[PDB]
Amino acid sequence: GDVKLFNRWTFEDVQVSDISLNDYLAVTSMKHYTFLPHSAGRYSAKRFRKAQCPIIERLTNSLMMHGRNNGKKIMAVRIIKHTMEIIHLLTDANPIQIIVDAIINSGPREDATRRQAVDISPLRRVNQAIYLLTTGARESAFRNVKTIAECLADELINAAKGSSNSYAIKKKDEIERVAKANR
Amino acid sequence: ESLVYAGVMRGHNDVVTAIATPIDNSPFIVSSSRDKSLLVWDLTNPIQATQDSSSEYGVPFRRLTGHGHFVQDVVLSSDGQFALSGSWDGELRLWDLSTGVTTRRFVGHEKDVLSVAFSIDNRQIVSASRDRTIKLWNTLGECKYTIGHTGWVSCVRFSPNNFAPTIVSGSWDRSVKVWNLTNCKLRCTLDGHGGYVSAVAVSPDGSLCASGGKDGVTLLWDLTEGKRLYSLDAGSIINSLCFSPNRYWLCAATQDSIKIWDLESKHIVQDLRPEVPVSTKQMLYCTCLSWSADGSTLYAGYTDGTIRIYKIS
């Protein structure tokens, strides 16, 4: 327990349930434990190197949108910290487990290309989960008194439970449905 | 009468090029590598091999990182506190082993230095380089006579006898030359090799001189008479040659194995070979053989940077 996120949250007790989505969320291995969701890492030179990037950092990078927020990663890390504290307040559990549960219960597993229904790979699954989570939080925050950190916390908490009150889960459902209608 | 795998030490990440041993049986060794560094090994508490897959016959004690390119030959001082490391960057450095810093750089070689050798009394320094010249130095970094060969002088060993200080020289011109240090002239060109002479060695008594290289055949001549003698045949290209201090042996680091030959029966007494497990390191051979001062342990530097110790049992 030497490395803790923000020196306030433990990594050892994080259980990544899905065996499929296990090598594409970098939380369990000790090599993927970091103090800060900020690395300035070169996780884009190769095709499958962003999978070995810490998952909190992958969540943080999707907050640097839109263009008005591009490159502002310290503010994104601040949002992540203030979101992880609200998560611990409203769930009394480890915020990293809530985050991995939300990313697991948000990635669509089947999609319709071309309209044949195709199955999503684990990497695109986690990418879509993160994209939907941060997109829903950002759209909740836009033109709203609620802070982006509070909207992110609410979205993550509702996605961890599996409730259809989270924009990501509603959208996952639509996506997979259109791949059931067009099977 | 025989050697057993005492243990292995890993302190270099690339080909170990030379291993010098203290003359006074001090419990350390100095090893160079193509990682541009020297390494002093703590050999006070040697963990003998247990086949438990761990341990280290020795601990790396002090690193010496001053050279700019591959270190190729290091010889220790008679006192044991000083080391002289020739490097491919073209200079020689004199290191205080206690502190770990360079005490004198030896400039004057234009190409990669290949072999260094202290005199019997640590007064003169000789170096061999790719510039086809043999350079004599002082302990003050001043270049004396600059001895000739027609190729890379790969090795130059100081005859351990004092009636007439002599430096041998093996070259990529396929020759072995005996230079009289007193006049810095030449005495006898010992020829007969069919390939580059990548290694020479002189027996402690200062009579027999060994020579090997590309030909794969170790020709042992006599320095005093300059006449060829028995023509011991090794398996592959010989990288290093060394005489046992007290057991009348001649070990040759070849690309197949380490072969020790008793010069009395002219027969192969043993052939040590690494216990590597796969065809990964397709070529993993020994580059530098080194007998300890007592003559009880043989240190072998390999191409992976590991050092394997074989004690007499």
């Binding site: - | 193509r34 591959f70 990529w172 590309k214």
Partner: protein, 71 residues
Amino acid sequence: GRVRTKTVKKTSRQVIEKYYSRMTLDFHTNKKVLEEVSILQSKRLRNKVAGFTTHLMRRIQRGPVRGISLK
């Protein structure tokens, strides 16, 4: 794409053709002798010739090649 051009490949086979004896299996030793039996106008081109020379010098040990290497 790391495909060697003719100048690198041709020089490699001509160097092995003449100086097979004074050519080792190590890049760093081969790039030193390549400076003694040739005049190349670039370090980058000298490295590519010695790296492909070492490459060929190991395939010769395998046994089949389309050079000559009388031996």
